[PDB]
Design an enzyme around this catalytic site. Structure first.
Site, PDB file in Angstrom:
ATOM      1  N   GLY D 144       0.813  -1.138   0.136  1.00  0.00           N
ATOM      2  CA  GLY D 144      -0.058   0.200  -0.402  1.00  0.00           C
ATOM      3  C   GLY D 144       0.418   1.301   0.218  1.00  0.00           C
ATOM      4  O   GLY D 144       0.434   2.335  -0.836  1.00  0.00           O
ATOM      5  N   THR D 179       1.481 -11.556   0.423  1.00  0.00           N
ATOM      6  CA  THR D 179       0.624 -11.852   1.854  1.00  0.00           C
ATOM      7  C   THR D 179      -0.429 -10.694   1.774  1.00  0.00           C
ATOM      8  O   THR D 179      -1.385 -11.273   2.560  1.00  0.00           O
ATOM      9  CB  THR D 179       2.031 -11.060   2.359  1.00  0.00           C
ATOM     10  OG1 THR D 179       2.100  -9.611   2.038  1.00  0.00           O
ATOM     11  CG2 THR D 179       3.488 -11.627   2.162  1.00  0.00           C
ATOM     12  N   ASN D 206      10.957 -12.127  -3.630  1.00  0.00           N
ATOM     13  CA  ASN D 206      11.076 -13.756  -2.329  1.00  0.00           C
ATOM     14  C   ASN D 206      10.941 -14.957  -3.048  1.00  0.00           C
ATOM     15  O   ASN D 206      11.485 -16.196  -2.002  1.00  0.00           O
ATOM     16  CB  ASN D 206       9.705 -13.379  -1.475  1.00  0.00           C
ATOM     17  CG  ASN D 206      10.131 -12.058  -0.437  1.00  0.00           C
ATOM     18  OD1 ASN D 206      11.620 -11.379  -1.138  1.00  0.00           O
ATOM     19  ND2 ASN D 206       8.729 -11.822  -0.486  1.00  0.00           N
ATOM     20  N   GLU D 254      25.615   4.474 -17.110  1.00  0.00           N
ATOM     21  CA  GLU D 254      25.326   3.461 -17.862  1.00  0.00           C
ATOM     22  C   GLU D 254      25.209   1.798 -18.282  1.00  0.00           C
ATOM     23  O   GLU D 254      24.481   1.276 -19.166  1.00  0.00           O
ATOM     24  CB  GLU D 254      26.697   2.599 -17.698  1.00  0.00           C
ATOM     25  CG  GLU D 254      28.357   3.805 -18.168  1.00  0.00           C
ATOM     26  CD  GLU D 254      29.211   2.641 -18.331  1.00  0.00           C
ATOM     27  OE1 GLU D 254      29.617   2.577 -19.059  1.00  0.00           O
ATOM     28  OE2 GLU D 254      30.204   3.359 -16.982  1.00  0.00           O
TER      29      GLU D 254
END
Ligand SMILES: Nc1nc2c(ncn2[C@@H]2O[C@H](COP(=O)(O)OP(=O)(O)OP(=O)(O)O)[C@@H](O)[C@H]2O)c(=O)[nH]1
Ligand SMILES: Nc1nc2c(ncn2[C@@H]2O[C@H](COP(=O)(O)OP(=O)(O)OP(=O)(O)O)[C@@H](O)[C@H]2O)c(=O)[nH]1
Ligand SMILES: Nc1nc2c(ncn2[C@@H]2O[C@H](COP(=O)(O)OP(=O)(O)O)[C@@H](O)[C@H]2O)c(=O)[nH]1
Ligand SMILES: [Mg+2]
Ligand SMILES: [Mg+2]
Lengths: 426, 53, 439, 439
Positions: D144, D179, D206, D254
């Site tokens: 959020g 989650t 993750n 770069e």
């Protein structure tokens, strides 16, 4: 008498140039602190080709260092002989190029170049006889090609009758170092071909192969590759500094080496090169030097000379030699391998002999060839350019600085014409 | 006869040099027009982005 | 008495001159510092060396020479070397940058900067002479300073002196061995503009000398030092007549009258005999007849060419040392008899002979044997026409595609000059063809 | 000299930042209180760490960072912990209430309360730099606050700085592990409003890391501490070029030049090798060629995706430690040879190489082996297009029933924004389809 101004630019240029100056200082007996501690009068007679003399009998390289990012220069100053370049000649910006030619040429370089030129003017004013400029740079990078051609053009306008020589690192055939090399290289060649007198083409791919195959270095580093490049740069101007039986300077090499004004890209080489372990088993004679010089596997350009013909070759020798041996061996090469030389130029080989060898050798020789085989380099760049240009890959990065398709198109056409012109004579 | 041969060579040389100078000035003018055009194109793009925000 | 001025131009010019001045000093007993251990008479007399050295001070002998270059390196070698005390500082003239093998650079762009300095020095030296006979100019054909500057100098001397002879010693481009890739342009241009101003040009060739050294002196590595010593010996025999008493003396003027049957044909080739190392000299009888015959073999020419394909127009023999006129005459008669040596029908009396009493001098550290007698020969033959033809061919091959032309045009040499010089050389080839046709 | 500002936003942002600052301190020898035991030079010089820390007081080193959250809890843990004495109090910015996974609260309702505070702090820090190159922003996509606030911040920075680069490190929603029940809404909304303001966003995942920890480090319980340390090593390798001398240096600019072929495609995935525990490292030969090949193994991606389904557009290899340029070059040629690794036809030159001399640092108490050399790879591939497609599918399934829509509408978002964001993502998928087609 004749003087050379040395300009180094971008990361690559500064790494090579720093090694170049280390080599010259050793040849002339000049200490890291600028003091002269040599052993022969011949070291001082022509010291001013490259150094200004400072009160207190010290010598200062007549060199200018240019970059868009300060980190490069800190490395130059902290390393060996970093202390010999005067601080006033470290000219730099803060932004970096980002490998964007357009930034290097039209924005960041556009602002920095005035400072560079003011330094160049101060140095040329101290000369008794300016002969020319030497520029060290890469072709596939941002600062290198951006400032490279920006400075070449400005200098050519101000000094239209001086000699402009460059030593350029070119894009390799198998592995890229930068994703957008084809754009940077095409844009750079477009301008170099109009403004310089001679360009030497150096390819790391070839240098890795030489140091691995001949010198047997299994862990070569940029310091070793820079050493090989330096040896060639130093060999080119030997006769401006040392006496010998038959001399040639930079102006003479241009006259003999370039039959047509646009065909001035050369493939350098060097001999003898042996590994340390094998040093003890091969006598060095003039025939041996000739044998290593005319060898496809000993070229520092990544282009096989056996795929074309030689418009002209220069051979510069250093050390006591028989003039007869030098003349005879060059004749034997042309007569036995006539299929590799053009028939419309009687005598394709020019020679010179200076009497003082590089320190540590009994004798040595430098090779410069002008071969039509070089069209392969230009051809490769053109095809890679085309593949990316057609889908405009990575193109918005250049047009966002104000460049456009018209500029890119013109550079492409000139690349293709140069190839056709080389093919025309084979 | 000697002076006349030498004077003709001098005149040719000077005319050659004048042509070289003309070409060099043209090169300079082409680059300056090009660079200025680039600055204007860049300026306009940047102004449009600001108008968008 | 009689005086001669030596002019040395460019790299080859200066290096040969160094070989010559060492030899002159040895023959006269003059030390490198200009002193003479037996300097009993000062300021004139004979002391025949007064032909080549000026007498000054209180026993200083100063050579009558001018050394000119556009670049400082070769002259500096002279200025800091053994003979640095022998030459007057104004006899050593330098520019800043060379001609880079560009004829036009030498002739039109750079030479104009020092030609007035060079001429003024020649003038000052000439004004101290009372019997000046001529100038000896040493140069190379394919060189930048060599031909660019020599041509410029020759025109100016023709205007100022006019009547003094001008003899040229020069190195002709070799047929195989070259040092530049632009030699065909420089050599054609040189002949075109210099031909009318020279009285007699003597030709030598590095390639031919390389082979002589290898076969006769057994030198497997005949570098420039050795070539310069052989050239020096020829020059010395030519000028020895002025310096030493002979049985038959020949001055400089008689050479151009005897060896030049037509104004456009004046390029005799030089030879010399015996050339022999000491090791072989010990076992041989170097008689007058043997030396004289050796000079006519194709294997001993100093110019790579083949004399058997032409005819002799004129032949000058110069003998030195222990030489008896009756032996000389008998040797010549044998040569006239031998059928392999052809003379043109229009020249019934092709030989002219000088004899000098002074034997040749060996430079300490040299290659050559000490001998009692030696012969120098100068011959004008039509065989050389072939060498000119080869040179013209090379020119055409490159000019056809205009290779390297822009390097001359950019210096102010109008392109049309290349065409005019070529047409002129075609005429020269034709002139040889006509004199060679018996009728 | 050249400076970089680090911005850490929300829960994920702050925790990764803590892992990074511990590592920076260890590499430079800076203590948790900002002091240095070997503080021999004060106020400048090199001390290359001046890129990331400013020099104040009399020997205190202060990190150039800003930590921002709406929720006070994560920042308080920083404020009372080990590094409480390392950061300036105004670098730790908190609100009073979190976004509660509502994009709109983070962007429109709450975020507006501190954005002016955050920007003023960034400005004050930026004004102390002389060579600011860009900003590094650390955030999560499904968050959020993470995306609500980051999007707000990105718009304001692109207006005020404009030309400075903006690089983003972020956590892409995993395909299985999640989650929040509303991640599909937050992620679609984020891309829609932030795509045009970012120069290059590096992706991590993750779910992918958990598998790496389990297979390479043998960790059966890979908690966030471990994930944060692995992420920290990637970030450090990217910025190491600015801090340490290399053979070939790479600045921050770069990266966008080499990795972004089109303005709308700028999501390279990151990888890293070797990842190995000490127990296995003792027996391994961690050569340049092996490490390089490891980076192209599907089992070592930090993003759960399958590279064999797409083509490469551009690959950037960053080497550290004991690396020889020749081996790097040979290793790349091997990769190009393998037929299993495909590149787009329009990119004949797909590689960029940087090499740094400084080897990687192991954090005491860590899992990773000490090694002599390591490689970080960043690559832009079309394989990722499938991940975008999965995300759009999940969005459609929920939007179709208007699940949770009133939670965004009630904060001031219009229903139209959901529709527009979805249409744009359809365009993004099409953009990948076109670059993926050879012709
Ligand atoms: N015999 C002999 N020939 C020489 C010697 N040195 C140089 N040469 C010849 O000189 C020719 C070239 O002309 P140079 O005299 O070098 O020309 P330059 O005076 O230096 O003027 P540039 O050509 O512009 O350098 C070559 O063909 C060489 O063979 C020498 O010591 N002895
Ligand atoms: N790698 C890594 N990911 C984390 C960590 N902490 C939280 N996350 C990820 O963050 C995502 C959710 O966004 P957050 O940044 O945690 O939440 P927020 O910033 O406080 O905003 P809210 O949604 O309003 O609570 C989750 O999907 C987690 O996987 C961490 O320590 N390491
Ligand atoms: N031979 C050599 N090449 C180098 C060295 N350092 C960098 N390069 C080359 O430089 C090219 C990259 O461009 P570079 O000049 O470094 O970037 P720039 O600073 O923006 O001009 C690559 O092709 C590298 O291989 C060096 O020390 N020696
Ligand atoms: Mg010279
Ligand atoms: Mg929170």
């Amino acid at each position: 008498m004749r003087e050379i101004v040395h300009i180094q630019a971008g990361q690559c240029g500064n790494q090579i140039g720093a090694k170049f100056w280390e080599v010259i200082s050793d040849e002339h007996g000049i200490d890291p602190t600028g003091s002269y501690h040599g052993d022969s009068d011949l070291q001082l007679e022509r010291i001013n080709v490259y150094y200004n003399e400072a009160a207190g009998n010290k010598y200062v390289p007549r060199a200018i260092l240019v970059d868009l990012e300060p980190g490069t220069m800190d490395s130059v100053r902290s390393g060996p002989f970093g202390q010999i370049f005067r601080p006033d000649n470290f000219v730099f910006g803060q932004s970096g190029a980002g490998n964007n030619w357009a930034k290097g040429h039209y924005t960041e370089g556009a602002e920095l170049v005035d400072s560079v030129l003011d330094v160049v003017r101060k140095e040329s004013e101290s000369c008794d006889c300016l002969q020319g400029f030497q520029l060290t740079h890469s072709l596939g990078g941002g600062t290198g090609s951006g400032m490279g051609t920006l400075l070449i053009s400005k200098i050519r306008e101000e000094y239209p009758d001086r000699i402009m020589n460059t030593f350029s690192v070119v894009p390799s055939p198998k592995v890229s170092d930068t994703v957008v090399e084809p754009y940077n290289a095409t844009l750079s060649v477009h301008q170099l071909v109009e403004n310089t007198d001679e360009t030497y083409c150096i390819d790391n791919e070839a240098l890795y192969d030489i140091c691995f195959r001949t010198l047997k270095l299994t862990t070569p580093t940029y310091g070793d590759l820079n050493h090989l490049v330096s040896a060639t740069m130093s060999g080119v101007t030997t006769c401006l500094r040392f006496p010998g039986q038959l001399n040639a300077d930079l102006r003479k090499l241009a006259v003999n080496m370039v039959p047509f004004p646009r065909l001035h890209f050369f493939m350098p080489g060097f001999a003898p090169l042996t590994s340390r372990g094998s040093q003890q088993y091969r006598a060095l004679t003039v025939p041996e030097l000739t044998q290593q010089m005319f060898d496809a596997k000993n070229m520092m350009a990544a282009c096989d000379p056996r795929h074309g013909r030689y418009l002209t070759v220069a051979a510069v020798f250093r050390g006591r030699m028989s003039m007869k041996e030098v003349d005879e061996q060059m004749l034997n090469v042309q007569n036995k391998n006539s299929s590799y030389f053009v028939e419309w130029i009687p005598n394709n080989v020019k020679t010179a002999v200076c009497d003082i060898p590089p320190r540590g050798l009994k004798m040595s020789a430098t090779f410069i060839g002008n071969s039509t085989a070089i069209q392969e380099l230009f051809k490769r760049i053109s095809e890679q350019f085309t593949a990316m240009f057609r889908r405009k890959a990575f193109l918005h990065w250049y047009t966002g600085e104000g460049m456009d398709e018209m500029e890119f198109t013109e550079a492409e056409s000139n690349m293709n014409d140069l190839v056709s012109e080389y093919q025309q004579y084979q | 006869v000697w002076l006349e041969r030498e004077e003709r060579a001098r005149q040719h040389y000077e005319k050659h040099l004048e042509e070289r100078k003309k070409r060099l000035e043209e090169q300079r003018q082409k680059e300056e027009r090009r660079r200025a055009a680039v600055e204007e194109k860049r300026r306009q793009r940047l102004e449009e982005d600001k108008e968008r925000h | 008495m009689r005086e001669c001025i030596s002019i040395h131009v460019g790299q080859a010019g200066v290096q040969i001159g160094n070989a010559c001045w060492e030899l002159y000093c040895l023959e006269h007993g003059i030390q490198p510092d200009g002193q003479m251990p037996s300097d009993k008479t000062i300021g004139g007399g004979d002391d025949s060396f007064n032909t080549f050295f000026s007498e000054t001070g209180a026993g200083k002998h100063v050579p009558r020479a001018v050394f000119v270059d556009l670049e400082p390196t070769v002259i500096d070698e002279v200025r800091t070397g053994t003979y640095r005390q022998l030459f007057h500082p104004e006899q050593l003239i330098t520019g800043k940058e060379d001609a880079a093998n560009n004829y036009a650079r030498g002739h039109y762009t750079i030479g104009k900067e020092i030609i007035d300095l060079v001429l003024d020095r020649i003038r000052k030296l000439a004004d101290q002479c009372t019997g000046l006979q001529g100038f000896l100019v040493f140069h190379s054909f394919g060189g930048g300073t060599g031909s660019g500057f020599t041509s410029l100098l020759m025109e100016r001397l023709s205007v100022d002196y006019g009547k003094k002879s001008k003899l040229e010693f020069s190195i002709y481009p070799a047929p195989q061995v070259s040092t530049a890739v632009v030699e065909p342009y420089n050599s054609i241009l040189t002949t075109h503009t210099t031909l009318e101003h020279s009285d007699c040009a003597f030709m030598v060739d590095n390639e031919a000398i390389y082979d002589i050294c290898r076969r006769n002196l057994d030198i497997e590595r005949p570098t420039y030092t050795n070539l310069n010593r052989l050239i020096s010996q020829i020059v010395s025999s030519i000028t020895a007549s002025l310096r030493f008493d002979g049985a038959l003396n020949v001055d400089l003027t008689e050479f151009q009258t005897n060896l030049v049957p037509y104004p456009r044909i004046h390029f005799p080739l030089a030879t010399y005999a015996p050339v022999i190392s000491a090791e072989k000299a010990y076992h041989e009888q170097l008689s007058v007849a043997e030396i004289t015959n050796a000079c006519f073999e194709p294997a001993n020419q100093m110019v790579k060419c083949d004399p058997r394909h032409g005819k002799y127009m004129a032949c000058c023999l110069l003998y030195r040392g222990d030489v008896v006129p009756k032996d000389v005459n008998a040797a010549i008669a044998t040569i006239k008899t031998k059928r392999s040596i052809q003379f043109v029908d229009w020249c019934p009396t092709g030989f002219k002979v000088g004899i000098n009493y002074q034997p040749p001098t060996v430079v300490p550290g040299g290659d050559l044997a000490k001998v009692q007698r030696a012969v120098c020969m100068l011959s004008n033959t039509t065989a050389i026409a072939e060498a000119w033809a080869r040179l013209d061919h090379k020119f055409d091959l490159m000019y056809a595609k205009r290779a390297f032309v822009h390097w001359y045009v950019g210096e102010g040499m109008e392109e049309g000059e290349f065409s005019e010089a070529r047409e002129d050389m075609a005429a020269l080839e034709k002139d040889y063809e006509e004199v060679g046709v018996d009728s």
